[PDB]
Design a protein around this ligand. Structure first.
Ligand SMILES: O=c1ccn([C@@H]2O[C@H](COP(=O)(O)OP(=O)(O)O[C@H]3OC[C@@H](O)[C@H](O)[C@H]3O)[C@@H](O)[C@H]2O)c(=O)[nH]1
Ligand SMILES: O=c1ccn([C@@H]2O[C@H](COP(=O)(O)OP(=O)(O)O[C@H]3OC[C@@H](O)[C@H](O)[C@H]3O)[C@@H](O)[C@H]2O)c(=O)[nH]1
Ligand SMILES: *[C@@H]1O[C@H](CO)[C@@H](O[C@@H]2O[C@H](CO)[C@@H](O)[C@H](O)[C@H]2NC(C)=O)[C@H](O)[C@H]1NC(C)=O
Ligand SMILES: *[C@@H]1O[C@H](CO)[C@@H](O[C@@H]2O[C@H](CO)[C@@H](O)[C@H](O)[C@H]2NC(C)=O)[C@H](O)[C@H]1NC(C)=O
Ligand SMILES: *[C@@H]1O[C@H](CO)[C@@H](O)[C@H](O)[C@H]1NC(C)=O
Ligand SMILES: *[C@@H]1O[C@H](CO)[C@@H](O)[C@H](O)[C@H]1NC(C)=O
Ligand SMILES: O=C(O)CCC(=O)C(=O)O
Ligand SMILES: O=C(O)CCC(=O)C(=O)O
Ligand SMILES: [Fe+2]
Ligand SMILES: [Fe+2]
Ligand SMILES: [Fe+2]
Ligand SMILES: [Fe+2]
Ligand SMILES: [Mn+2]
Ligand SMILES: [Mn+2]
Lengths: 700, 700
């Protein structure tokens, strides 16, 4: 058994990149011994991701190997560091090396690179990989020194070609006992073998398994165009995320805070923007340490920004508004906001937030800053759907693709901080990263590529990890796809696209607690129940939308009411189908009135059918009252839309057979009474002002 | 001015017939002086209504006139008595006689009788009547004596021919100044002039007016085949019935009573015969003075007669039953019953009563006996219709005809005792009339004529008046036309044909008082009303009719009930349409449940639509309960059909949302509760016996 104290891992790294630190973490997990060559030096090996080169690695290794030229007792493994993670122990590594019977074992790959013609000089192998890969090899220090000492070439010459031609010398190959890891027992190069590699999980550790050769490799090399696939594996292997310990690089549990440049982007008509702007004032971060930048591209949102701008300017240390009259494109606005933080050394963190991002966690900014990453984004999903603000994978031409663990992350079956290829809508970028690693102005612009994609690609080109955290509940994403702005209050029509946000804005705040019991629902008259339904904003906007239409009924008008025999009992009103809001109001009936009715009348079941839905207006000089009658309905919904005294005097509902009077209606509250046989009722005269009510004859 | 003390009326009468007494009454009304010739003698003038004759009148007048042969101061009017009424005063009579300028004025008529060939010897007249009528003439005693003294012929020779040939002597006509009353100024012969005579009314007196000649005749002669028309006029003229004094020959205001032979006739299947038989025990007349005869021709009624025969035999002095096994025809049975009283000198009055006669006035027998007529009938009409138990007129061939005052009598605009040509169903005949005036056995039989018509014709042939009294409310006539006896209880199906009687038998006795307020209706649970509806007999017969059908439902059966979502809530029941009683029960709903519902739920209006009508049976070994559910109805009718404790234990209705239980239902009482939304209810288990209820889902 070879002593693990005799094993030395040698790698090359000119800077402590995130890839290098990910490698060191995997090495320290198995208690490896790693000597790093080249830290602080300039990389003279040319463009590594674009062409051949990397000879500077061999030059540095050759100089380092002169100390160990006679050390037969020492085993040395050389690996890359930026795109390599370790998945096995040094004990298992050395046992597999001895089993190989080799004295210097190179990794094998599918492609004969960089000279494809040399592939016939290679020995013929069976199902295994056939050609040498310089990204990783392990052997005796003496044998390695005899190979690397022959290096006499330029810093940008290809290292793999140098090792390949030495391996293709049959005399040298057999004298020094050089070999290749054909079946990936030790080294797993990913390029050309993505469909052979799967994750193998354990309790507190993850590995990869080669399903082609049924092996458990020690070294995972994301060589060539497999960087993102290695990022994916690196989220688990070796102790990234485990079924028992969760993520092992996050903060599972949570004096001046860093100064932050908060940039808000409104690049399309967005629902509930006033609610988004008011939510900025509620973010749990000292506003004296936050600078606000807001780019609005929509003239539709100019009144919204203007309403809240005094409070924003009074809240944050400094504010800046870039409006639609500046003709900025989204890529230009995002370049400008980011460069405003880059050119300010007092900007310690950059926080980009889009209008369709609803942050339910007011501690989002603290949590992401405390995660201490270069770039990190909170996970935000469309409510009840799989769509969210990140991608797990890329198609070969850098387009959307679904990763194998995307659904587990969105559903939060696995939580942590994840290295992902794409993020959007909300992210926190370290300001020093913008200054030292991405100093260019054209991060979002420069191409015909989409700005969101150009931003992520600009960071991936620099080796910057794009982190995504589902460690906490952060928020959701608003549906903005087909937002109809051709209304006086477009957010009234958002009951389908954004139901959660529509409820919080238009459904009464105490509605849910009333539905869950708690003695909020009243019964002022026998079998006439009284519960809060609509918020004051819903009533104010609904009435406003009615008067904006203006076509109130009068004579020649018929309602589904029943007086003495044949008799016409009309109201001055506007029906929901007149204004195009019936489909929306019927959804409110199905979602909110239906379940309330079944709770109050045990035994009754309803789908909330309603042909007659309309808003009644009462006025002393128009029609101030409604004479006794029945309703063509099983039960009737009567919602007060304004305040008694403030907006009108008099009014009220009176149930004759009980001598019971709803003297003082409540704005947004609803009456629930049977419509036939027993509740002959009457609308008491409106003596002053104007009285609005919303009426629905349910289940006719 | 001729002194009325010089006027003498001479008439002939062998007996004081009703016609003679009607004449004397009219004479005494105007204070006439009447000498009657021939009382007590045998009529030897032959058949007067069948051929020529009447010379016995002239023989008696001739002998009487010898006293007055020289009395120039005396005016004498001769008239018939059996078919003559007086309509004017002697003063008006004598003024018109002087105006004629005649010394002996005969009545004129349209027909030259009895020798039609003599009519050319008559003088030519204009529009007036041309020929002599011997029924009435007025003249000086001297002139009359010179005419009648020439009588030298047989008792059965024609008097009119004797007077006619004397009048056709032109020398005698002009010497004695004989004349005819061409334009009916004094005498009005009815034969050949019915369309010229109308009644002229006054405050306390009625006359007749001749519309052809615009005259007011003094003497009305119903000569020949106009007896019934004179009977009609005699009901008014001169003081029969007047607009101010009413009838002047009736009892407008009401110690052993006379013995009576009560004959009951059941000649067809008759509805409510048990109720008729029980009503006999309630007639307000001492039953020790009544003999009961009952002829039943229907085997369908044998059980009914048998049920009540012990009580009848115990009630009346003597009883006799003639059943269907005797093969008697209605004419033979009515002959037998009438002759049983005729051959008994202890029978003082005969009271014939048919099964379709409902006597609502228990004092009917006293009232009719106190009227002191030979034959008298109480007016009984079909409820709300014009059909009744008498005719006002006859067609020329002795068939039905409507008299000019028929509707006034049936509607009781004119009330009194009326001389009518036909009566039926109920009449009281003086026993001595049967013994002295109609001794024949074949009163109803003998012809192919209908028995009811043969009976009336037998009395009209003898000059017996058939009196009808609408002076009081006496009763009604049952509809027996299409009585369907193919049921276990046929009277259940009588809601249409006899609604008044159907109500009194099957609608609860305290129902009406409950509908009119009076605090009988209860409200045991909120909006669940409780009122009496069906009598105990209705419940017992309805349940019996259900079990006689026997086809109770079970599995595979569906009702219009609503449980949790889609759910089947059936009952072991029989629907009304299965047994052919839906049209009848729907009538009960329209007539009795409808108005009660509108009274209890002010504002609601209903036509009592009900598709689901059925009788539910609950049993411990079958289906003892009904689980919570709603009803496919606006309101539900729940009628208990038997007694709790006596017929079943347990059971009852429970309304869940009110924690209210109808623990003790009442037989024949009905529950009225809404069927939807608020009154989720349940049928409590029937632990012992059998529980029946009638259910209707109204206004679905
Ligand atoms: O700026 C740098 C770039 C690279 N390196 C070292 O050199 C190693 C090679 O870089 P990469 O992993 O990105 O390159 P790949 O493994 O994808 O394949 C590439 O390797 C080197 C290139 O010259 C080859 O042409 C190509 O095969 C790195 O893992 C790192 O250890 C630095 O130390 N500083
Ligand atoms: O039985 C009788 C019948 C008749 N009379 C007297 O004789 C009168 C004539 O009898 P009716 O009124 O019934 O006969 P009418 O007036 O209809 O015509 C008839 O009169 C007598 C007949 O002989 C004639 O042939 C016919 O014209 C009676 O009014 C009555 O006063 C009797 O006193 N006893
Ligand atoms: C929702 O419920 C709360 C409490 O149940 C309501 O609150 C109160 O408001 C009144 C005056 O508006 C105060 O006098 C009370 O002290 C408040 N109580 C509490 C506990 O805060 C609240 O008004 C309800 N919402 C609406 C829209 O009516
Ligand atoms: C109709 O109403 C009368 C009285 O309102 C009911 O009569 C009483 O019957 C009870 C026992 O049945 C007696 O104790 C009372 O004394 C009776 N009262 C009177 C005033 O007679 C009668 O029962 C009702 N009819 C039905 C069918 O229930
Ligand atoms: C690494 O070595 C330390 C001793 O310095 C030991 O506590 C730890 O358990 C080792 N880890 C593994 C995975 O063997
Ligand atoms: C008839 O005479 C009596 C007197 O005896 C008189 O009282 C009565 O009024 C008279 N009737 C008429 C109608 O003249
Ligand atoms: O004004 C009211 O409160 C009653 C009006 C009513 O019942 C209706 O909407 O038909
Ligand atoms: O048994 C009862 O009283 C209730 C039965 C019922 O409600 C029904 O007829 O459907
Ligand atoms: Fe309307
Ligand atoms: Fe209403
Ligand atoms: Fe049924
Ligand atoms: Fe029911
Ligand atoms: Mn590499
Ligand atoms: Mn006569």
């Amino acid at each position: 058994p070879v002593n693990p104290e005799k094993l030395l891992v040698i790698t090359v790294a000119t800077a402590e990149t995130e890839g290098y630190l990910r490698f060191l973490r995997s090495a320290e997990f198995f208690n490896y011994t790693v000597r790093t060559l080249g830290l602080g030096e300039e990389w003279r090996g040319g463009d590594v991701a674009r062409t051949v080169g990397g000879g500077q690695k061999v030059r540095w290794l050759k100089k380092e190997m002169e100390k160990y030229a006679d050390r037969e007792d020492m085993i040395i493994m050389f690996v890359d560091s930026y795109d390599v993670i370790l998945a096995g122990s040094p004990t298992e590594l050395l046992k597999k090396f001895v089993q190989s019977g080799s004295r210097l074992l190179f990794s094998a790959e599918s492609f004969c690179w960089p000279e494809w013609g040399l592939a016939e000089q290679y020995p013929e192998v069976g199902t295994g990989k056939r050609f040498l890969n310089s990204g990783g090899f392990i052997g005796f220090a003496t044998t390695i020194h005899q190979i690397v000492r022959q290096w006499k070439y330029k810093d940008d010459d290809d290292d793999q070609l140098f090792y390949t031609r030495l391996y293709l010398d049959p005399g040298l190959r057999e004298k020094l006992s050089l070999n290749l890891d054909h079946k990936s027992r030790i080294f797993q190069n990913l390029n050309g073998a993505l469909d052979e590699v799967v994750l193998k999980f354990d309790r507190n550790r993850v590995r990869i398994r080669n399903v082609a050769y049924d092996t458990l490799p020690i070294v995972v090399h994301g060589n060539g165009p497999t960087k993102l696939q290695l990022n994916y594996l690196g989220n688990y292997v070796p102790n990234g995320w485990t079924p028992e310990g969760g993520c092992g690089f996050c903060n599972q549990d949570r004096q001046p805070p860093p100064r932050v440049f908060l940039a808000v982007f409104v690049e399309q008509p967005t629902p509930f923007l006033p609610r988004f702007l008011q939510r900025l004032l509620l973010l749990d971060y000292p506003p004296d340490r936050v600078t606000l930048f807001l780019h609005n591209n929509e003239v539709f949102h100019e009144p919204h920004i203007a309403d809240s701008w005094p409070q924003l300017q009074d809240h944050f240390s400094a504010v800046k508004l870039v409006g639609p009259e500046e003709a900025l494109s989204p890529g230009e606005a995002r370049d400008m906001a980011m460069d405003l933080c880059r050119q300010d050394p007092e900007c310690e963190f950059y926080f980009s937030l889009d209008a369709d991002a609803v942050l339910t966690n007011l501690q989002t900014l603290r949590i992401l800053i405390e995660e201490n990453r270069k770039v990190i984004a909170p996970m935000l999903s469309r409510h009840g759907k799989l769509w969210s603000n990140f991608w797990g994978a890329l198609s070969p031409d850098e387009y959307y693709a679904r990763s194998e663990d995307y659904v587990e992350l969105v559903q939060r079956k696995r939580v942590g901080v994840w290295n992902v290829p794409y993020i959007s809508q909300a992210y926190v970028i370290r300001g020093d990263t913008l200054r030292m690693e991405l100093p260019q102005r054209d991060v979002f612009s420069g191409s015909d590529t989409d700005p969101d994609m150009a931003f992520c690609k600009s960071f991936r080109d620099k080796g910057i990890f794009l982190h995504l955290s589902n460690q906490h509940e952060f928020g959701r994403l608003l549906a903005t796809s087909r937002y109809d702005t051709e209304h006086l209050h477009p957010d009234l029509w958002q009951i389908f696209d954004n139901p959660v946000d529509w409820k919080e804005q238009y459904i009464h705040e105490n509605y849910s607690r009333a539905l869950e019991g708690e003695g909020i629902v009243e019964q002022p008259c026998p079998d006439v129940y009284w519960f809060p339904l609509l918020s004051e904003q819903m009533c104010d906007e609904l009435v406003a939308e009615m008067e904006h239409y203006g076509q109130w009924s009068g004579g020649r008008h018929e309602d589904s009411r029943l007086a003495g025999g044949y008799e016409n009992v009309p109201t001055v009103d506007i029906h929901m189908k007149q204004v195009g809001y019936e489909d929306q109001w019927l959804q409110l009936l199905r979602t909110y009135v239906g379940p309330m009715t079944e709770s109050l009348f045990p035994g009754y079941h309803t789908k909330a059918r309603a042909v007659m839905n309309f808003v009644v207006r009462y006025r002393p000089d128009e029609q101030p009252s409604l004479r006794p009658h029945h309703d063509s309905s099983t039960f009737t919904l009567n919602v007060a839309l304004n305040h008694k005294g403030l907006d009108y005097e008099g009014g009220g509902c009176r149930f004759l057979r009980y001598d019971c009077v709803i003297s003082s209606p409540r704005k947004g509250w609803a009456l629930l009474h049977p419509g036939r046989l027993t509740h002959y009722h009457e609308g008491l005269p409106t003596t002053w002002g104007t009285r609005y009510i919303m009426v629905s004859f349910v289940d006719p």
